[PDB]
Amino acid sequence: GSHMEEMIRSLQQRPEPTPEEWDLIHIATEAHRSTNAQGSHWKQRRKFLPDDIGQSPIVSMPDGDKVDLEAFSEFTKIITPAITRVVDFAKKLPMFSELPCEDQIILLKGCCMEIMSLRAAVRYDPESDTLTLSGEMAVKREQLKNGGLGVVSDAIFELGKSLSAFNLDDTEVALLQAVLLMSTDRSGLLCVDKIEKSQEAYLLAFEHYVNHRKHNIPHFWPKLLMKVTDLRMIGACHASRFLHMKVECPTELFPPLFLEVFED
């Protein structure tokens, strides 16, 4: 192109975001930052879930990983704000908020656990080997496992540990969320084509933003896509396990919003 353009683009050749993609990137990034509990100040003012909690699984589950009701209660007491923040994030993306209300509900139920799991995973702390839930509650593998998640907890920790080396920034987390949200692998959607077109726009903007960032680890983009796949598997194991939870435990132990999201 122009001399200046060429000068500016010398150390690049992989496609950068277009100006339209930068707009999309900026809105998603801000939507995430404004809905992500604690402004990058999470590790300072976080508290550990007491070591004596989450050591006593005694409610049976079909897969044999039992549940500690006390730990389950501690986790579910803070889950309502966590789900609400995912909803707030989604409502801030124009391509989501212009969908029929019914499609918005289906998309949210479809991705809620995928996004929450990703938000917990990016707060993995290698030193203490904990996840920080909602940026306030540091939990150990055993505690999160026994408090209801079973093997889903091991999957989240594994993801969190592997994501450490990716050094994701807010934009990359935000775009993963948008890609998870705008999925047509749900049933009963009306605006299938429009949702797909939106996902494709986010995916391309995401690939181009990845080029822009020039991460030091190789094969970054396909590596990141593989993490999207892991997150969707985490979502599915959670949906399966939630069904069993509901068979074993009375409704009064589940906050209303938690039941609503993970319904069918």
Give me the helix-helix angle, 170-181 and 101-121, nearest 10°.
140
Determine the residue with CB nearest ligand 4HY: 148
What is the smallest separation between the CB atom of 223 and ligand 4HY, expressed in angstroms? Answer: 22
Residues numbered 159 to 198 that lie near ligand 4HY (CB under 6 A) are none
* Nearest CB to ligand 4HY, comparing residues 32 and 208: 32
Residues numbered 49 to 78 that lie near ligand 4HY (CB under 6 A) are 72, 75, 78
Q: Where are the alpha helices (DSSP H) in 34-140?
A: 69-77, 79-91, 94-97, 101-121
Burial per residue of 156-194, b for 16 or more beta-carbon CB atoms within 10 angstroms, e otherwise? bbebbeebeeeebeebbbbbbbbbbbbbbeeeebebeeb
* Nearest CB to ligand 4HY, comparing residues 99 and 168: 168
Residues numbered 104 to 123 that lie near ligand 4HY (CB under 6 A) are 116-117, 119-120
Instruction: Determine the Cα–Cα distance for residues 261 and 112; give it in Å rounded to an integer.
Output: 7
Instruction: Determine the Cα–Cα distance for residues 110 and 97; give it in Å rounded to an integer.
Output: 16
* Nearest CB to ligand 4HY, comparing residues 80 and 211: 80
- The residue within the footprint of ligand 4HY, chosen from 24, 31, 82, 168 (CB under 6 A), is 82
- The residue within the footprint of ligand 4HY, chosen from 24, 149, 168, 178 (CB under 6 A), is 149
Residues numbered 234 to 253 that lie near ligand 4HY (CB under 6 A) are none
CA R_g for the chain: 19
Question: Does the footprint of ligand 4HY cover residue 147 (CB under 6 A)?
Answer: yes
45 close to 138: Cβ distance less than 8 angstroms: no
Task: Find where tokens 């579910």 sit.
Answer: 76
Residues that bind ligand 4HY (CB under 6 A): 37, 72, 75, 78-79, 82, 116-117, 119-120, 133-134, 147-149, 156
